[PDB]
C-alpha cells in the first residue's frame, strides 16, 4: 500500500493513529518483515496525484 512518509512509524504492533485504527492494524504477536521505500519520483506528480 502507499502511505504518507511520517505514517511509516504507525505500521508496527501496538501503535495507534488513523492508519493504525481505521485502515491497517497489526496484531501484537506479529512475525515477519516490513519493507518501506520513498517513491516521490513515481507516485507523486507536479500535476497532482
Amino acid at each position: 500500500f502507499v502511505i504518507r512518509g511520517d505514517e511509516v512509524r504507525q505500521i508496527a504492533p501496538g501503535q495507534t493513529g488513523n492508519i493504525a485504527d481505521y485502515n491497517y492494524k497489526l496484531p501484537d504477536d506479529f512475525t515477519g518483515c516490513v519493507i518501506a521505500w520513498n517513491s516521490n519520483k513515481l507516485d507523486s506528480k507536479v500535476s497532482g496525484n
Epitope: G5, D6, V8, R9
Partner: nanobody, 124 residues
Framework: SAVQLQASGGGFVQPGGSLRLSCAAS????????MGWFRQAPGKEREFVSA????????YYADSVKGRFTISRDNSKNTVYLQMNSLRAEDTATYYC????????????????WGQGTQVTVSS
C-alpha cells in the same frame, strides 16, 4: 543493518565565513532515525555538534554552536545539508556525519556508524 555514509565538503576558509558540507546515506537500516555531525579537534576528544530527525520535525543543537550552525534536509536527493557562518579559529577540526538508528533520540553517547573524516581549516 548495512548503511554507508558519503561525506562531501571542507577545505581552507577565512574566519567569519561560510562553507559547504553535506552527507548522503545509502543501504538499508532498521528504521528512519536521526542524523548528526561529530567534531574532533586535534589533540582533543570527539564531541557532537547537533542532531536532526529524519522528517525535519525537531532539531537539536549544542550550546556552543547555537544560533550559528543549522542543518536541513533534501527533498529529492536523500542527502542532509548543513550551513554555517561566523566561523572562528576553534572550528578547524575534523567532522563526521553519523546515523542514529532509533526513532526517538535520548543522548548522543551511543553512535551506530561513522563517516570518513572531513578536515576543515580556518585561519588568516
Amino acid at each position: 543493518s548495512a548503511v554507508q555514509l558519503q561525506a562531501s565538503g571542507g577545505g581552507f576558509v577565512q574566519p567569519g565565513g561560510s562553507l559547504r558540507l553535506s552527507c548522503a546515506a545509502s543501504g538499508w537500516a532498521e528504521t528512519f532515525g536521526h542524523m548528526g555531525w561529530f567534531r574532533q579537534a586535534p589533540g582533543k576528544e570527539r564531541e557532537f555538534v547537533s542532531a536532526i530527525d529524519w522528517w525535519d520535525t525537531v532539531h537539536y543543537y549544542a550550546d556552543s554552536v547555537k544560533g550559528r550552525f543549522t542543518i536541513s534536509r533534501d527533498n529529492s536527493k536523500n542527502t542532509v545539508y548543513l550551513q554555517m557562518n561566523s566561523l572562528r579559529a576553534e572550528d578547524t577540526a575534523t567532522y563526521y556525519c553519523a546515523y542514529w538508528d532509533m526513532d526517538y533520540l535520548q543522548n548522543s553517547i551511543p553512535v551506530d556508524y561513522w563517516g570518513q573524516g572531513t578536515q576543515v581549516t580556518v585561519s588568516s
